[PDB]
Ligand binder design. Structure first.
Ligand SMILES: *[C@@H]1O[C@H](CO)[C@@H](O)[C@H](O)[C@H]1NC(C)=O
Ligand SMILES: *[C@@H]1O[C@H](CO)[C@@H](O)[C@H](O)[C@H]1NC(C)=O
Ligand SMILES: *[C@@H]1O[C@H](CO)[C@@H](O)[C@H](O)[C@H]1NC(C)=O
Lengths: 219, 215, 248, 153, 219, 215
């Protein structure tokens, strides 16, 4: 039974500073060297920083050396990571891990749930919802939530009534710096004029709720 | 530095199969190699350390072996809960820790022929100025499907971007959505827009094409 | 009770006599999941729930885990880890009228399938179309409930059937429900092996003149060894004398 | 979500509630008294009333007052008592084995009367207060200085 | 060490009644619920009936409810199964099995060797033995034991002298209600006129012994 | 009700192989799956109960696993005494106990080409009135061999019935006897009677045919 909780992550502009805090519980925090390891969205794991058990030795990789700082308060059983002069490369989920000390080498014993930190130079924007109508052996329709930031956005069909056959594609960070997402649902071609399909998109960070009707194209 | 090549990039296997994943290092690491597991979305979890030490609380079916540069992770009998992404990480260069590429294990099934749909840009989008052509491949397996865009019989590369969902929980089939995005001026400059799909389950490439402004 | 308002009764802190399920052979259908009825009267449970209602025969198969249909989805549902029994028997002689008995109602439409052990009795006008139904019936606005047609001449598939679902729940608490415990006659002045409320021993049970307090159940000597007990069925104090032994 | 139900100054009413292995034991005792200021002094044993098999985790409680009566609350502790059962099986007196040396002697002798004399009751060990660690102070230090600060390499 | 012996099985016409008896030994028959399980010829197993330890509870599958009856005599340590109004589907091997009672539900711990029960509306008939001659690199000949009932029938070659290369196929119940069986033997083509091959077929239920010669076709 | 699908229908493996058999249920059953073993002719015997419990007196090499709907029985090292039929039976629905289809495990060997022999009806049988044509496939492996009857180049289906012997104790090969039975009138109505055999060990179908009353 060992618990690690990350906090302090968020959205910040490039060149700014942030303070991540890790709370350790159910083990001797002061008697184990701590590690900070980040994973970028969609990428693999990348070791970031290490601090000794006594908080006297601090080591960083070349990617962040001279830019990040690691400290720890054994009295409070807390680990602090100050990330100053943040760049777009720092957008990732950061985890704090105990060393374990069973080997002469560094290994990770336990992993916390981590905290997300996003570095971008774009302000919060309301999503734009557009339809994707089907045409004339079933049919498929959908909605496009384009030009929104930051993540996430919750998409539902028929206020959650339509569940089966619904696929919500992961959002893609387009070159404009915003996010583009697509949701689709496949329904029988017969039930296309009687059943009404409306997609509900909610963006709490921007506080934008949009209900967009979807109907077949007319030609 | 040290580069960790993990193979295969992605393997298809069924439950109970004896799965094996290889990890090669650019230089020699004595016994400082570990294996971790990561489910989609969930955080990584430790499986093996020292390349020959099973982490406490892990099923015994996982076993690490190998020394020097080549190492192997073997699951004697695959289980439904064992479908995840496995990473190999060397610890020799302690202050230059590196991780392997990863080997995603998918659920093995029969080849599924993709369903190809082509959607032209919506008039509302054309009002803004941009135009997006959507090519949807649905319900196919494996995920290796080539999607090509043709404009007036001219190949297009880099003008679009794809997005593939994870293996489906119902039929274990994939879906891909290629979005060819361009400006309005580049949209009226051409007439024919086609999407060609080549898949292992297709005897020949399948092309879905439409002429601009003809319905 | 009607299926949508399926009547729930609770059973706890009582000895559960299952002889009524055995002797009664008039049960048309009977299926147990998770627990076998034969090994049921000698097993304790924290609580028992008797959920009873009325359906037609064709729908009886629908009351069970992994079932689908009007009855299964909109009126009564069971969990996929259900551990209990389901009993169903005809009630045509009681639940039928010459002009048709319409006192049994069931939910015909609902926007979602019920959660496990969920009771819904709302009479909201079901919206079957795009036009919202503002409490008024009409085009795509139908009453969610419909009445069974029960007549003496109705077919077996539509004849009324009373269903009772017993679910036995055993939580991390002491079990107040146990099956009947068998006892035997009491013999005094003879070396017998006695067992009073789990207190076991060997000895001779003799009438005594010790006056226990009303709430006290056993006696003890300096050694702490049982020296007297109280017969649970009849409140009389029995001295226990260890059976004679010695040297020859 | 109910898991149980049951239905059945001038008076001093004492009650004791305690949970053991999921069983809620309630003892009670009603006696006549003539005193309003404080608890009347005297000894009376409490006999059990109920053993509810609720099996709940309890850590707080409260009372319920009739609004158109003071009450006392004490906390139980794991103590050892020497109880005297009379002929009829009723507790007539009790001695607390940790109240003071006299009671410790009573519990040691298992008697309510202590004969004139000296009785050895307990042991007594003084516990340590703080720890002391001593190692020789370094005299020889490994010469890392001349390797890093060497004038010439 | 637990023993269960079945008895009372046999051949009976449709609509009749039969009584099977199982004898248990080397365990407390009175403290374990007993199960009757039937296996049809060529099919899998199938649960039939269950009786509690105290002989007060009886349960059956729908296929036999209201048709069979299960009882037990703890004094004799015996289990009785009265099968009244037997149909052709009842043709199967019946086993008695102990429960085990280690779980809340029914599992089968120990099984007996079982007893066969056949339901048919055909009387005992003598088998008809016919030859199957070879032709012109070895050759193969055989005999056909057709139109016989009930099972079994013992087939030998050269009064048991010819053993190697002999294949006796399982009997097949043809639409006529009888049984058809084939026995074959492969011998070198050279030894086809000197060596004499005679197949001996014995049907004890019908008490029919037939010795049929097999010789190559002449034409 | 509850339907139990046991796969594979039949598998070929050698001694010492890590054999695996899967059993799936129509609905979810908590841990109420049991595995029994049955040799040809002998009575079934218990191997695993509750799907995660080895029965007393059973070799440890057998192991059950799985929960919910999918379960697996694994033999780490196959042994000669393990070639039998395994049944998976659920117990969740107490009074609807059902047993699985079964998965026969045969002895793995090389592919053996069947020997095909065609025998016309005996004159003695023709005297009675019936006529049986016997097609014998001998010494082949695996048992999957398609046998087809042709009369005057017309396919016949349902007019015959097959019977297959068990895997041989000497060469572990199979034998099949197809008996095309018909009346005398239907026998003289046609001239050519042929038996076509298609087997994994045959590069092409092998037809053994004869003309009626020519010898
Ligand atoms: C138990 O039986 C006795 C008779 O032996 C009877 O007097 C007594 O009332 C019974 N107890 C109860 C609770 O009925
Ligand atoms: C009650 O609390 C104890 C520890 O305080 C815990 O172990 C136990 O699980 C709790 N009871 C329940 C029902 O969770
Ligand atoms: C004990 O009980 C008896 C009657 O049972 C009574 O006469 C006596 O007074 C009681 N003891 C005392 C000390 O009062």
């Amino acid at each position: 039974e060992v618990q690690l909780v990350e906090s302090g992550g968020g959205v910040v502009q490039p060149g700014r500073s942030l303070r991540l805090s890790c709370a350790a519980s159910a083990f001797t925090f002061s008697s184990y060297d701590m590690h900070w390891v980040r994973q970028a969205p969609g990428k693999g794991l990348e070791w970031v920083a290490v601090i000794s058990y006594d908080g006297s030795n601090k080591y960083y990789a070349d990617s962040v050396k001279g830019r990040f700082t690691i400290s720890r308060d054994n009295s409070k059983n807390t680990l602090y990571l100050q990330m100053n002069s943040l760049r777009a490369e720092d957008t990732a989920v950061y985890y704090c891990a105990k060393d374990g000390g069973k080997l002469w080498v560094y290994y990770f014993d336990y992993w916390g749930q981590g905290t997300l930190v996003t570095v971008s130079s774009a302000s919060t924007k309301g999503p734009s919802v557009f339809p994707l109508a089907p045409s004339s052996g079933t049919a498929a329709l959908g909605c496009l939530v384009k030009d929104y930031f930051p993540e996430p956005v919750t998409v539902s069909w028929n206020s959650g009534a339509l569940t089966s056959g619904v696929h919500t594609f992961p959002a893609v960070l387009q070159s404009s710096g915003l996010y583009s997402l697509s949701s689709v649902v496949t329904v029988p071609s017969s039930s296309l004029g009687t059943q009404t399909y409306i997609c509900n998109v909610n963006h709490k960070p921007s506080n934008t709720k949009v209900d967009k009707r979807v109907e077949p194209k007319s030609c | 530095d040290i580069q960790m090549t993990q193979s295969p990039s992605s393997l298809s296997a069924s439950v109970g199969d004896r799965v094996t994943i290889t990890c090669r290092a650019s230089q020699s690491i004595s016994s400082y190699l570990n294996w971790y597991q990561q489910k989609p979305g969930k955080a990584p979890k430790l499986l093996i350390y020292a390349a020959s030490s099973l982490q406490s609380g892990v099923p015994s079916r996982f076993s690490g072996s190998g020394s020097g540069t080549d190492f192997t992770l073997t699951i004697s009998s695959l289980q439904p809960e064992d479908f995840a992404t496995y990473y190999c990480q060397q610890s020799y260069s302690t202050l230059a820790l590196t991780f392997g590429g990863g080997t995603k294990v998918e659920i093995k099934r029969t080849v599924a022929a993709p369903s190809v749909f082509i959607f032209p840009p919506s008039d509302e989008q054309l009002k803004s100025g941009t135009a997006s052509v959507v090519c949807l491949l649905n319900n196919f397996y494996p995920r290796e499907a080539k999607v090509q865009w043709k404009v007036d019989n001219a190949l297009q590369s880099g003008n679009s971007q794809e997005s593939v969902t994870e293996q489906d929980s119902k039929d274990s089939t994939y879906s891909l959505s290629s979005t060819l995005t361009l400006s309005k001026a580049d949209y009226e400059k051409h007439k024919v827009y086609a999407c060609e799909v080549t898949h292992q389950g297709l005897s020949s490439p399948v092309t879905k094409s439409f002429n601009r402004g003809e319905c | 009770a009607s299926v949508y308002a399926w009547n729930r009764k609770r059973i706890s802190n009582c000895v559960a006599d299952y002889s009524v399920l055995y002797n009664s052979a008039s049960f048309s259908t009977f299926k147990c999941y998770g627990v076998s009825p034969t090994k049921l009267n000698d097993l304790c449970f924290t609580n028992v729930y008797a959920d009873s209602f009325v359906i037609r025969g064709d729908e009886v198969r629908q009351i069970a885990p992994g079932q689908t249909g009007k009855i299964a989805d909109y009126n009564y549902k069971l969990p996929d880890d259900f551990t209990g029994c389901v009993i169903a028997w005809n009630s045509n002689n009681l639940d039928s009228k010459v002009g048709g008995n319409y006192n049994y109602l069931y939910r015909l439409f609902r926007k979602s399938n019920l959660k496990p052990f969920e009771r819904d009795i709302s009479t909201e006008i079901y919206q079957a179309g795009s036009t919202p139904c503002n409490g008024v019936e009409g085009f795509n606005c139908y009453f969610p409930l419909q009445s069974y047609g029960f007549q003496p001449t109705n077919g077996v598939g539509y004849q009324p059937y009373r269903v009772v679902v017993l679910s036995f729940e055993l939580l991390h608490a002491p079990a107040t429900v146990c099956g009947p415990k068998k006892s035997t006659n009491l013999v005094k002045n003879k070396c017998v092996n006695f067992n009073f409320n789990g207190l076991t021993g060997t000895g001779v049970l003799t009438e005594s003149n010790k006056k226990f307090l009303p709430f006290q159940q056993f006696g003890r000597d300096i050694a702490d060894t049982t020296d007297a007990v109280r017969d649970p069925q009849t409140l009389e104090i029995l001295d226990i004398t260890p059976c004679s032994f010695g040297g020859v | 979500n109910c898991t149980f139900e049951y239905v059945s100054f001038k008076n001093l009413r004492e009650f004791v509630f305690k949970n053991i292995d999921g069983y809620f034991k309630i003892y009670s005792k009603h006696t006549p008294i003539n005193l309003v200021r404080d608890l009347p002094q005297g000894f009376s044993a409490l006999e059990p009333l109920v053993d509810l098999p609720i099996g709940i985790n309890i850590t707080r409680f409260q009372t319920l007052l009739a609004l158109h009566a003071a009450y006392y609350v004490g906390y139980l502790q794991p103590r050892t008592f020497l109880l005297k059962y009379n002929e009829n099986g009723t507790i007539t007196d009790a001695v607390d084995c940790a109240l003071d040396p006299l009671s410790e002697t009573k519990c040691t002798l298992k008697s309510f009367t202590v004969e004139k004399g000296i009785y050895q009751t307990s042991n007594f060990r003084v516990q340590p207060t703080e720890s002391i660690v001593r190692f020789p102070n370094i005299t020889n230090l490994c010469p890392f200085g001349e390797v890093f600060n060497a004038t010439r390499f």
